[PDB]
Design a protein around this ligand. Structure first.
Ligand SMILES: CSc1nc(N)c2ncn([C@@H]3O[C@H](COP(=O)(O)OP(=O)(O)OP(=O)(O)O)[C@@H](O)[C@H]3O)c2n1
Ligand SMILES: CSc1nc(N)c2ncn([C@@H]3O[C@H](COP(=O)(O)OP(=O)(O)OP(=O)(O)O)[C@@H](O)[C@H]3O)c2n1
Ligand SMILES: CSc1nc(N)c2ncn([C@@H]3O[C@H](COP(=O)(O)OP(=O)(O)OP(=O)(O)O)[C@@H](O)[C@H]3O)c2n1
Ligand SMILES: *[C@@H]1O[C@H](CO)[C@@H](O)[C@H](O)[C@H]1NC(C)=O
Ligand SMILES: *[C@@H]1O[C@H](CO)[C@@H](O)[C@H](O)[C@H]1NC(C)=O
Ligand SMILES: *[C@@H]1O[C@H](CO)[C@@H](O)[C@H](O)[C@H]1NC(C)=O
Ligand SMILES: *[C@@H]1O[C@H](CO)[C@@H](O)[C@H](O)[C@H]1NC(C)=O
Ligand SMILES: *[C@@H]1O[C@H](CO)[C@@H](O)[C@H](O)[C@H]1NC(C)=O
Ligand SMILES: *[C@@H]1O[C@H](CO)[C@@H](O)[C@H](O)[C@H]1NC(C)=O
Ligand SMILES: *[C@@H]1O[C@H](CO)[C@@H](O)[C@H](O)[C@H]1NC(C)=O
Ligand SMILES: *[C@@H]1O[C@H](CO)[C@@H](O)[C@H](O)[C@H]1NC(C)=O
Ligand SMILES: *[C@@H]1O[C@H](CO)[C@@H](O)[C@H](O)[C@H]1NC(C)=O
Ligand code: NA
Ligand code: NA
Ligand code: NA
Lengths: 323, 323, 323
């Protein structure tokens, strides 16, 4: 008998409490958030006893939500089209018959010939950009990169509610930019993020990450209850490492890529500087949903709540009557 | 008593009208739209008394759904690694003690020394790419850019219905491409969009936007009722400015980025031309959903409609009987 | 009378079978899959009797989920700023009055003058990068590209369940990478995909696609029932051509873009090599959802199932009683 009142309390609390209130059933929701992100990196570093600025270590440069900060390099200066022996011992050859299709991809095409790379070692010859890259001793990382700064201009708009807000508040001043200390909880509206800070929030050691290269995710969440104040609509920052496979795998431990700088002589012959770049890639991911009171969903939601509590009390009353 | 018939009419109209008909409950919906976009920009401009073509002002060049049209530049010719004073007055120095870590990021690293940039002004010395960039007088914009054209090839497919359509209709001819006048309502299938037109549809003044740089969004919506004709499935174009924070903020008003062109002398020393690029970034955003009649959702939906009207009439009859 | 039992069986089977079991209503679902992709292309080709490696034919180089493998080129060596006649016959001129605004976009700006490109043909003069590109005879494709390899490191994580898996299994070894043969069904965890294989899975002929250029989609789906074994969570590969409009359209049949290599003389004058690149663009699209048993959805789902079967039997009993 009392279980009838108990079931009534559970129905009323669930349908009118969690379902109607906690789940904001009274609210119209906009999930088609419109986001824009623009980035700018600042910092200088010493690498190969040369100073490196944003135009040196940032790529691509257009300042999108995805960019790489180069922290390590294998530089192959003055490559030229020609024939030369493969550098790595993986291409060791003693007989020209060993230089065949079974060989792994290399700096160029295989001539089928076999050549001496050094007095001690002989490898397969290739036609391509010469000389081949040599990966015998590890290259240093750009320590100063830990202090580089990332400037994130993130604009978001829920169009259903014609609501626009950004991580740059309208009262932001040059002094703020010069002195604000970003923190996900303490100061979400500071547009400057310290690269090292981003790496640590992601749970990574800058030394190792900068050695291997990696992909870090900067997630920006705009979950805003437009019923509450405009100043309650604030961005929630999360940080992680997206290439999680890399740490668990010995075959491929990080992130790197190769690109070249192309030059011509007055003579007119082409030569290039090859670059194997290790760096930290930053993906700025923006998500959000907004909700605002609307009478229509309040009517439909409350009507559904009353029909639900009624059907519940009816069925429990029947089940109690028969049993 | 009559309110029983009124409630019956509201239930029947809501569940069989808005819910079943207006909401196309009889329809199976595909929301996993598959989209592809390829872009090509055409136009020539005069800047620094030099002609600039797509390979000069478009970046990146691969013709993706996101690209920048450079409209303004600060060009720093023939930079070389070395030591030089900072150009901007923000780095004004009178004592070498002022050249410290508190200084903002600059062209290079700080030597701690203090040097005379000019007879009137003295600033901090830096090691890096020299000379530093000078932002004393504003640079002009590339007016002709207002007439550049954007070619958008957008292919979409709802795989559930094996439906494929594109903004390029199969009867498109070279004359069409040469003469069609794009309009979101009047001619949605003209693949050529005038940059200036795109800027205005976005509610922006090309002169100001091209001065500050900005991000414009070209949204393409494919909402198609595959029950209706194939020719009713047409793209709906919307235009906006995504970096809305920029206009409301004095600290950062637009969009720009820095990249370099790298050169070598026969002597072998590196020198580069630095470029601070202001431009309009175009993000082509494609969305869509499709619906087609399917008997299953018609059965389940109609059954749910009858159970709903029945439960409604039952509950209203009970509430009327007791009260 | 028997139709009452029939309706009871259909209600019980639908609500407790398809709705509760087949639809895994007992399961909590994570649809906010977190994905990261890194790519690396390997292979060498012969083009213009020059060897081409990843730094030559891959763009952009940063190894993102979207990259192009250049398979065809129109190379315009040593362009210089100046005046020259337009190359293509589309710009044929006999009178300087024909060189006007009605002309289509060209290599540069129009001087309004008319010049002889050859003894047989006269075209409009332009100021810009000279000479203009000549598209009279088709250029070959890089056949070897069919054998290039794409290395895909895809990391995925359902955070709700703190579940992380990747196409690189933790027991992956160098021998595996050297010898595994990718197949969507037979070996989903081989990280090396043969470009030609990808083209064929997409239903395309490499010769034609490489002639015209195109966009191929590599879709990776992680639909995992975390109730089952970890080793049951495997990636499902799908392949397609995203620029489907291209094959149905004569005006634009493929995908190409133009970029330049910029050079300076010791004299200091600029000259560039223009490149019209035809290639295959690969878009790696990752999707997924995960589900794991949770008691809460089991309680709510089973309660809803009993209320549903009860309401069904009640309404069918009433409809049978009255009729
Ligand atoms: C044997 S066929 C093939 N095709 C690829 N596209 C490809 N991309 C990467 N790999 C190989 O897969 C391994 C992991 O790649 P990785 O994380 O880039 O390490 P890594 O920097 O030593 O790769 P590389 O220096 O050899 O370019 C590595 O041994 C690399 O050589 C690839 N192998
Ligand atoms: C003080 S630490 C820091 N780190 C950044 N990554 C960064 N990126 C941009 N800023 C600064 O934030 C301001 C807004 O950036 P902006 O919209 O790019 O304007 P701007 O073109 O004058 O920026 P810059 O010329 O200084 O590169 C501006 O004063 C710029 O100097 C940045 N400041
Ligand atoms: C007449 S205004 C205009 N503006 C564009 N941005 C634009 N982009 C491409 N087109 C034209 O539209 C046609 C299809 O473009 P496409 O697939 O790139 O073929 P294509 O390689 O011969 O294009 P182009 O060599 O002329 O650059 C083609 O004739 C091309 O010239 C464009 N036309
Ligand atoms: C970062 O900069 C601070 C000064 O603001 C300096 O004390 C510190 O050593 C720097 N860190 C690195 C890794 O260079
Ligand atoms: C700037 O405006 C925001 C808007 O809510 C407010 O929270 C903040 O206190 C303001 N800062 C200053 C310095 O007025
Ligand atoms: C350019 O110079 C190099 C060495 O100085 C020489 O090998 C090459 O043949 C020259 N180019 C041409 C086209 O002769
Ligand atoms: C755009 O081109 C038209 C000719 O089609 C010309 O009349 C107009 O002045 C041009 N606009 C600009 C800003 O150059
Ligand atoms: C091209 O086909 C579309 C398909 O609906 C049609 O609307 C249009 O009128 C056709 N144009 C011509 C010139 O036939
Ligand atoms: C290259 O020339 C410049 C000036 O002509 C000179 O400063 C530099 O030392 C030269 N390079 C080398 C390696 O000497
Ligand atoms: C691809 O490589 C194989 C050797 O593994 C060779 O037999 C075949 O001819 C190559 N295909 C092309 C198109 O070069
Ligand atoms: C590697 O681990 C996976 C995990 O399920 C397993 O299926 C596979 O058989 C393992 N391979 C080897 C060689 O142990
Ligand atoms: C550079 O040389 C070319 C031809 O050798 C000449 O036309 C040009 O005027 C030179 N540059 C300058 C600034 O004189
Ligand atoms: Na290697
Ligand atoms: Na500045
Ligand atoms: Na053409």
């Amino acid at each position: 008998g009392i279980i009838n009142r108990v079931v009534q309390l559970l129905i009323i609390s669930y349908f009118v409490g969690w379902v109607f209130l906690h789940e904001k059933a009274y609210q119209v929701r906009d999930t088609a958030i419109e986001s824009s992100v623009v980035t700018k990196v600042k910092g200088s570093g010493l690498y190969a006893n040369r100073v490196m600025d944003v135009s040196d270590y940032v790529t691509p440069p257009q300042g999108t939500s995805v960019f790489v900060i180069i922290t390590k390099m294998i530089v192959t200066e003055n490559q030229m089209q020609g024939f030369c022996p493969e550098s790595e011992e993986k291409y060791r050859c003693v007989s020209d018959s060993q230089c065949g299709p079974e060989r792994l991809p290399g700096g160029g095409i295989l001539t089928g010939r076999c050549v001496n790379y050094s007095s001690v070692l002989r490898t397969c010859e290739i036609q391509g950009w010469c000389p081949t890259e040599v990966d015998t001793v590890e290259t240093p990382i750009m320590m100063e990169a830990e202090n580089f700064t990332i400037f994130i201009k993130n604009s978001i708009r829920f169009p259903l509610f014609n609501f626009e807000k950004g991580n740059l508040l309208p009262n932001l001043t040059a002094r703020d930019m010069k002195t604000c200390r970003f923190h996900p909880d303490k100061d979400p509206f500071c547009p400057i993020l310290r690269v090292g800070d981003v790496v640590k929030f992601a749970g990574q050691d800058f030394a190792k990450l900068a050695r291997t290269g990696g992909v870090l995710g900067i997630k920006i969440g705009w979950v805003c209850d437009l019923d509450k104040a405009w100043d309650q609509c604030i961005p929630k920052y999360s940080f992680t490492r997206l290439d999680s496979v890399s740490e668990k795998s010995s075959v491929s431990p990080g992130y790197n890529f190769r690109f070249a700088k192309y030059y011509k002589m007055e003579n007119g012959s082409e030569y290039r500087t090859l670059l194997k770049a290790f760096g930290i890639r930053f993906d700025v991911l923006v998500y959000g949903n907004a909700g605002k009171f609307n009478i229509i969903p309040t009517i439909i939601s409350s009507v559904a709540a009353f029909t639900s509590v009624g059907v519940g009390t009816v069925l429990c009353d029947i089940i109690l009557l028969n049993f």
